[PDB]
Amino acid sequence: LAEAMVDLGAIEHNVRVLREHAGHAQLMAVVKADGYGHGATRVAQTALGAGAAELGVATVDEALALRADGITAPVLAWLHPPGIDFGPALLADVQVAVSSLRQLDELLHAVRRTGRTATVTVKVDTGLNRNGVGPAQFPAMLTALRQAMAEDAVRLRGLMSHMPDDSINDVQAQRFTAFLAQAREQGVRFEVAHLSNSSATMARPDLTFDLVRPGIAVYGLSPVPALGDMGLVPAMTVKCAVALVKSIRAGEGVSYGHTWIAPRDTNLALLPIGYADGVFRSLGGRLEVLINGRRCPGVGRICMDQFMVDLGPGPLDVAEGDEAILFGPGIRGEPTAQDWADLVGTIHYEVVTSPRGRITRTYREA
Amino acid sequence: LAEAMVDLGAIEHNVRVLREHAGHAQLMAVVKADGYGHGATRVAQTALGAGAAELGVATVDEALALRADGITAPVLAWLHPPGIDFGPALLADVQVAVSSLRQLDELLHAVRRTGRTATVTVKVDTGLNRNGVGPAQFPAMLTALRQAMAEDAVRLRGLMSHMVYADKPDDSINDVQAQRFTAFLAQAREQGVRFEVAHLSNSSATMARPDLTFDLVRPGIAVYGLSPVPALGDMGLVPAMTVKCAVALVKSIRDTNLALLPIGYADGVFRSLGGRLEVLINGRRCPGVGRICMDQFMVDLGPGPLDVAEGDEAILFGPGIRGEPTAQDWADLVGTIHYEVVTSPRGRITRTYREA
Numbered sequence A: 001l002a003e004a005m006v007d008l009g010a011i012e013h014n015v016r017v018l019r020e021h022a023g024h025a026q027l028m029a030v031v032k033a034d035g036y037g038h039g040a041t042r043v044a045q046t047a048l049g050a051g052a053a054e055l056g057v058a059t060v061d062e063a064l065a066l067r068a069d070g071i072t073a074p075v076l077a078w079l080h081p082p083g084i085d086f087g088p089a090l091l092a093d094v095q096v097a098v099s100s101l102r103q104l105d106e107l108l109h110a111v112r113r114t115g116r117t118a119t120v121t122v123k124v125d126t127g128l129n130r131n132g133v134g135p136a137q138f139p140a141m142l143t144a145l146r147q148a149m150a151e152d153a154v155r156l157r158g159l160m161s162h163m164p165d166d167s168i169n170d171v172q173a174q175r176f177t178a179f180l181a182q183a184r185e186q187g188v189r190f191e192v193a194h195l196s197n198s199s200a201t202m203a204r205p206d207l208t209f210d211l212v213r214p215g216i217a218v219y220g221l222s223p224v225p226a227l228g229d230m231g232l233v234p235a236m237t238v239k240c241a242v243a244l245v246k247s248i249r250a251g252e253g254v255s256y257g258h259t260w261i262a263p264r265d266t267n268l269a270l271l272p273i274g275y276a277d278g279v280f281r282s283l284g285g286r287l288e289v290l291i292n293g294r295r296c297p298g299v300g301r302i303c304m305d306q307f308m309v310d311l312g313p314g315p316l317d318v319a320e321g322d323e324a325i326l327f328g329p330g331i332r333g334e335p336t337a338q339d340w341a342d343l344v345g346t347i348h349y350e351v352v353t354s355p356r357g358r359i360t361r362t363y364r365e366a
Numbered sequence B: 001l002a003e004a005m006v007d008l009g010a011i012e013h014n015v016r017v018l019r020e021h022a023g024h025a026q027l028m029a030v031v032k033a034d035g036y037g038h039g040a041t042r043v044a045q046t047a048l049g050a051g052a053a054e055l056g057v058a059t060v061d062e063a064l065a066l067r068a069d070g071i072t073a074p075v076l077a078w079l080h081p082p083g084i085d086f087g088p089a090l091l092a093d094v095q096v097a098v099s100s101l102r103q104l105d106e107l108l109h110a111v112r113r114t115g116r117t118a119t120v121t122v123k124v125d126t127g128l129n130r131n132g133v134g135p136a137q138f139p140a141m142l143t144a145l146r147q148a149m150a151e152d153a154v155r156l157r158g159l160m161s162h163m164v165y166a167d168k169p170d171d172s173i174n175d176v177q178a179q180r181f182t183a184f185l186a187q188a189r190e191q192g193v194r195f196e197v198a199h200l201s202n203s204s205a206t207m208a209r210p211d212l213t214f215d216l217v218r219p220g221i222a223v224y225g226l227s228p229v230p231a232l233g234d235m236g237l238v239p240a241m242t243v244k245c246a247v248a249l250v251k252s253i254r255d256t257n258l259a260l261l262p263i264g265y266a267d268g269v270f271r272s273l274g275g276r277l278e279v280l281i282n283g284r285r286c287p288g289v290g291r292i293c294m295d296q297f298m299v300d301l302g303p304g305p306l307d308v309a310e311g312d313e314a315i316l317f318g319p320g321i322r323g324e325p326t327a328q329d330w331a332d333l334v335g336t337i338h339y340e341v342v343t344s345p346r347g348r349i350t351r352t353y354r355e356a
Ligand SMILES: *Cc1c(COP(=O)(O)O)cnc(C)c1O
Pocket: A030, A032, A078, A162, A196, A197, A198, A199, A213, A214, A215, A216, A217, A223
């Protein structure tokens, strides 16, 4: 019907490029939100197979699904509900990042229930101000960790914070540096530090610490759009089969509300996916699809489960069953996720986490 | 962490309301797209319990899921990709709407291979200009349907078509489509063919143009309690879906406090709502601040003594009883319609049910 084809060969490519940019630092591939819509387990397997060292996700739930799928590499999780029981994480060897004193108390309580040493990371706030430990709270946090470490309740794995040439990076980096120094000055030692997302990894190599945590560039989407594709290959191609071809006459309206009235006799193609499958309704009359090497603009509203495109009045070169490409890396001239983002007024992150319903996720091996 | 809670009590209500409007017309509850994101199977069971006569879906796949879920009531599917195997539909007592001769020929091949008579409906074009047979091709279709009927390959169940407007009941195209539909009924007659039922109505036509009702109505959006003509108000319906999550964190920052809600655009929280939406927390509206992130966003609780605690419920949208925003409200802010809003929740927003 429709598919979101994920090319694990591009994933492999993207991780290799990130590894080169990260230089000496190891790579934590970020596979939260089911691999940014690309499949967390499959992308994790491929990224690890191409040399990433660790995996990063938001929730402990995300981490356990990777484990139930047989993933054995290190996994870190950093976004936790209040009151969470950290037990299952400790038992399944999931690393936990804490962003407050209460959360460390929650974690130490589970260490006591399970008898399982926690591999902890502290998430500090460097101007971000959503969550993370503040400079004011950091001394108390350090004192607790030192005591926890002394009895082997925790392993002090990491310090982390979250963000190109804007000064605001330099300051955040400095502030990050001060946290490392305070820790240093109070005799608390972390095995690694990391502050770099995809953008910082690729555009600000001077700010890379021991690890980098790229998400968006692993899927080959550009971490700084204005700069171009930065050598990455977008891994997702969303496409579907043409369900019908029909000619229509000038002056005829198409689809709900007849917001489009043909200015001339033309051929149309019905594509059988719509906004319930993740084709943003705001794309109506704005997107273009690629069919047999040609761009075809959407005409009329996007419906719940279908929309039409105009093939033009030229010699008909489309048949039922042919392939229409909605977005992809662009290599065949098809539109990109960035193109949709521009049309809709959003970011490619939201575009690749949109496909669903009848768009089936499929993979091309590397 | 978050849920899309579907009140099956509202469903039931909405369906009785629709039955009142449908009068003697039989009701086909439309449950395509997994019941408009509300859950096809559970919504179908409730609707049939509320008096719906039949179910409508877009694809045979959707119909087969209802069958696999124990539904035995009549189900009609009307959008079929090229290459579809109609065999499994026939074997599962799924009705098939065909919109071309080629589709009927495919269906007749399937009839011969399975040994099962097809219960067919013909989808005709009365104005949408999408997928329906057009008047010039209808005679050849009628002829093929008569020969098959005579030879017991098919049961001639319905004639159907779809309205160009989903929400403007008094535009004259509505009237025009209904007269085009009658003309198709005229053609059938002249070809010595009759259909058991004819249907053209969606939620809007059902509730606001009952003069245009034929034998059957096909309401979708109204079953879920969403207004088919938003300008007229809630039209006596009750939106069945409530989306909410817990406050994950409270944060002191003029001087004020923020709540972190741990769902974002990957969960279906449209990114363009950022800095525009409001949530309901302890009976007060709390405006979003900053951008919606992929898996979280912030809202302003205001300054002073806190009335809000981590773990408290935040309502993103619902019927509006408790003063929470509505799906229509999100639609107004995003520039869309509530249909797209209710098919948006996913990822960590878990669908739940309240029994009626
Ligand atoms: C989402 C996320 C990342 C990945 O960021 P990108 O911009 O996708 O590279 C890294 N670290 C944290 C804490 C994140 O939440």
